[PDB]
Write an enzyme that holds these catalytic residues in place. Structure first.
Site: not given
Lengths: 486, 146, 165, 50, 130
Positions: A188-189, A162
């Site tokens: 997000e991480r 992705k």
């Protein structure tokens, strides 16, 4: 403007919700306040007004931890909504909700700032006609073309390249359309953010010593819900600057759009509002509307947003994905099975969709070729099932030709990206829209029925196919000649 | 403490399922807006700011790290619970344990089908990576044939 | 000349003071503390620093003042070599393998000596003659006493004679 | 709850049934193909029987 | 009250005492019934928010110490056979040996209707048993 520097005092602190009392009157809603008392805090504290309790008291949501915060603590209004730096000086930098460079790479040195919350374009600003966004990728440009000002739903989690597709899109939009990109990481991480930043620096899409073509705005999970609900709006404001002032076709990546909904739901829950069905905030439709409506193609420029969608519990009827799909103009699905077969980008052509797949928008030849490709792929699936049941030799003459052409098409939809030149070691290809249409139209008719199947694997255009076929023929001839000697 | 001094630490939470219940009790007893399954609106933030503190510092900060191994209990193999989903959405992969495998003899009862590691081969030694590259394919083919 | 980290920030390339600090350590575990301290100071170790650490490990009395169970100098040096090779992208030179071979011969482990000899031949382009001769002497000394392998391994054991405890 | 788990168990049972029936399909197709060889060797034994 | 008597027999008398409780679920049910009138917001399903701590405090008292030993047998009621209900689910971690009964087994004429695939024991180890 008249409330610039107005003094207030903290009146209540319940978790991330802080109430501030102003003797001169609460500033307008969505106004940014600064807590002047940094007695023991390691970071500055800023509050956003979300509600008015009375003529003097106003409820706010903190953007950082509210630790060591006492009542009657002095607070000063900033003069308006949150302000974010916008310009060409923000390219290649990492920002937060407050528009502060968190990359430790020196001062931003912006020349202007814009408020986070801006009304969406009026009905008179909408584009006269729909236009296609040539991404340079054969699969997207052919089967699921993107539209300027449209929203694309990118399905498929990690493990399907992705990030590579995102970087390729960022590179191609600047190469062809000359428009920049803004990446927004919502919930997000932090590890994945670092990985993406390193990959972008490695692919030269963010050139520290040169010119970058992407802006990063990260709101991480460890941050309170007040920031994850505004990082997307900050990135959207940055994109709007390029859209309006410079009149470009900008890109806006959101990772993910579900995290935005989750953050807004949490913020609403903190305020004490009654959740709607399932448990999302009652303003779920309005929250997504105030964001998506700002992403459109105006008379000055456009903003095409590629948003990564997550379906909770694999339930496509859930209010979050259900409401999100009402704003999406396209859908790019990534499958692991396609990736495991050696097809990159791993896109399932029969699972994707697009609304501009209509002769009234795209050229009639483009629509006819796309429909023919889809029909051939469906027939190929049917024939694959048949042969898996009975066998290959049972297919009629027409079925065999259909199978061969469909296999060539499947091999021909793959493409090497320029972003992967360092790793794969092979030059990437940027295929023009008309070139793809002509190549697929010729292949469907049967002009290229003599070219070997593998000549279409990881190539761009039709000329690349011919060159690869010639090279394969030369290699085979040399090997045969060497064999005859021994 | 060890992370910020160029050393490596391993933290195990047994288990975050009960911490969520304790936090829910604290919030409800203090009259805070309940959410899904009566949990407050800060449960996801709580678990995220807990797990996000486990990192791998860059060489410019000593190179220390904290490895987190949170444990979560599912009821009747229901991974659709509020807390389970939140923890799964935060961690970098999961190690799913199957009751049928445990009773069948497989111990540890690791369900390789539902288990995942988002880090991938980057967290493997050269020899282990070389063996795993083929072991994964062999196991996948064996499962397909079975 | 100047070096930069993964994020493009310049680092410190003056490792001389840290090498001197390493040369002062008595127990080689303390040498690990110096590496950690210089890492925090944004001064990544060089090949010379790792060689100094290996020399300290070879020349130190023990890991710590208090004895440690199952402590091994060879394992620590091999772990350090693996660190500098994989996680730092530094190729060990002849000096590092020389220190490893010296430890192997000094400890009497003549089989690890054979492995290190092969490694040096394949990479270092030659192992010192003295170390090879000493390792062969240790092997012969072990052979004469009959202690080529642990005694319990050479004992015959049938299907039901294997005690798995 | 229980009703949710009831539907989950029902869906799991249907999945197991589908897998078993797919295996049956594969086995039957194996014999279909394996004893498909008759087609080449038929239509000649019964000539004077006609 | 019963646990106080058992604790006295364990400590002062130093004897090995058996403690049979039937049913331990009713304690949780009574607490939930009274919780509503105490001004506490109900938790999920509808139990009191202090379901875990209230049960844990009582369970930790039912234990064998260095002075004596208590062999406690507790009967747990699973409402509507929903083993995932919070009250039954919270008691599993407070036990050394769980015997899970199944209605399907009972309907087949098998008594005791024990489901061996759902039971567990702590001493099911080669070191403890033969």
């Amino acid at each position: 403007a008249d409330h610039k520097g107005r003094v207030g005092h903290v009146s209540q602190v319940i978790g991330a919700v802080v109430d501030v009392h102003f003797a001169d009157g609460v500033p307008p809603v969505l106004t940014a306040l600064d807590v002047v008392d940094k007695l023991g805090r390691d970071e500055p504290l800023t509050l956003e007004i979300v509600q008015h309790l009375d003529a003097h008291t106003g409820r706010c949501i903190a953007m950082q931890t509210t630790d060591l915060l006492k009542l009657k603590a002095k607070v000063v209004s900033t003069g308006g909504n949150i302000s974010v730096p916008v310009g060409r000086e923000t390219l290649g930098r990492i920002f937060n909700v407050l528009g502060d460079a968190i990359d430790q790479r020196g001062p931003v040195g912006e020349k202007l700032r814009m408020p986070i919350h801006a009304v969406a374009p009026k009905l008179a600003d909408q584009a006269a006609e729909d236009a296609v966004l040539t991404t340079g990728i054969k699969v997207i440009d052919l089967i699921l073309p993107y539209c300027k000002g449209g929203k694309i739903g990118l399905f498929g989690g990690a493990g399907v390249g992705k990030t590579v597709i995102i970087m390729e899109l960022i590179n191609n939009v600047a190469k062809g359309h000359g428009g920049f990109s803004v990446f927004a990481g919502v919930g997000e991480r932090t590890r994945e953010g670092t990985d993406l930043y390193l990959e972008m620096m490695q692919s030269k899409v963010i050139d520290l010593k040169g010119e970058s073509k992407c802006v990063l705005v990260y709101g991480q999970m460890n941050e309170p819900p007040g920031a994850r609900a505004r990082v997307a709006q900050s990135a959207l404001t940055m994109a709007e600057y390029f859209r309006d002032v410079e009149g470009q076709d900008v890109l806006l990546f959101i990772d993910n759009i579900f995290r935005f909904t989750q953050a807004n739901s949490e913020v609403s829950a903190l305020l004490g509002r009654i959740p709607a069905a399932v448990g999302y905030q009652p303003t779920l439709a309005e929250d997504l509307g105030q964001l998506q409506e700002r992403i459109t193609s105006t008379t000055k420029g456009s903003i095409t947003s590629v948003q990564a969608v997550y379906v909770p519990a694999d339930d496509i009827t859930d209010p979050a994905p259900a409401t999100t799909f009402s704003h999406l103009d396209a859908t790019t699905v990534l499958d692991r099975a396609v990736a495991e077969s050696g097809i990159y980008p791993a896109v399932n052509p029969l699972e994707c969709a697009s609304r501009i797949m209509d002769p009234d928008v795209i050229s009639v030849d483009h629509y006819n070729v796309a429909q023919d490709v889809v029909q051939m792929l469906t027939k190929y699936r049917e024939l694959q099932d048949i042969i898996a049941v009975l066998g290959i030799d049972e297919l009629s003459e027409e079925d065999k030709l259909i199978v061969d052409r469909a296999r060539k098409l499947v091999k021909f939809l793959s493409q090497p990206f320029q972003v992967a030149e360092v790793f794969t070691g092979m030059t990437g290809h940027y295929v023009q829209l008309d070139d793809t249409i002509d190549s697929f139209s010729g292949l469907l008719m049967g002009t290229y029925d003599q070219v070997p199947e593998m000549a279409f694997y990881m190539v761009g255009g039709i000329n690349s196919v011919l060159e690869k076929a010639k090279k394969m023929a030369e290699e085979a001839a040399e090997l045969e000649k060497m064999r005859r000697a021994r | 403490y060890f992370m910020n001094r160029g050393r490596h630490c391993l933290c195990v939470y047994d288990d975050l399922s009960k911490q969520a219940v304790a936090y829910r009790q604290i919030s409800l007893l203090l009259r805070r807006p309940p959410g899904r399954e009566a949990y407050p609106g800060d449960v996801f933030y709580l678990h995220s700011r807990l797990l996000e503190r486990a990192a791998m510092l860059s060489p410019g900060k000593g190179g220390g790290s904290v490895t987190a191994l949170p444990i979560v209990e599912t009821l009747s193999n229901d991974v659709t619970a509020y807390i389970v989903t939140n923890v799964i959405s935060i961690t970098d992969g999961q190690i799913y344990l199957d009751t049928k495998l445990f009773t069948g003899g497989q111990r540890p009862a690791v369900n390789i089908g539902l288990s995942v590691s988002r880090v991938g081969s980057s967290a493997q030694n050269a020899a282990m990576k070389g063996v795993a590259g083929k072991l994964k394919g062999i196991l996948a083919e064996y499962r397909k044939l079975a | 000349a100047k070096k930069y980290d993964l994020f493009g920030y310049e680092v410190d390339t003056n490792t001389a003071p840290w090498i001197e600090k390493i040369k002062k350590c008595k127990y080689y575990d303390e040498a690990g503390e110096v590496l950690v301290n210089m890492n925090v100071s944004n001064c990544p170790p060089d090949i010379a620093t790792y060689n100094a650490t290996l020399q300290c490990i070879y020349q130190s009395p023990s890991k710590q003042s208090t004895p440690v169970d199952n402590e091994s100098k060879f394992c620590a040096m091999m772990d350090l070599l693996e660190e500098m090779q994989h996680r730092n992208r530094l190729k060990p030179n002849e000096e590092s393998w020389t220190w490893v071979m010296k430890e192997c011969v000094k400890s009497g482990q003549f089989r690890l000596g054979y492995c290190i000899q092969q490694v040096m031949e394949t990479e270092c382009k030659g192992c010192p003659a003295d170390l090879v001769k000493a390792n062969e002497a240790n092997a012969q000394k072990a052979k004469t006493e009959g202690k080529e392998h642990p005694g319990h391994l050479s004992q015959q054991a049938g299907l039901f004679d294997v005690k798995v405890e | 709850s229980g009703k949710l788990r009831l539907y989950k168990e029902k869906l799991e049972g249907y999945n197991r049934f589908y897998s078993i029936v797919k295996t049956i399909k594969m086995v039957t197709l194996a014999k279909y193909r394996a004893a498909q060889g008759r087609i080449r060797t038929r239509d000649f034994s019964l000539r004077y029987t006609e």
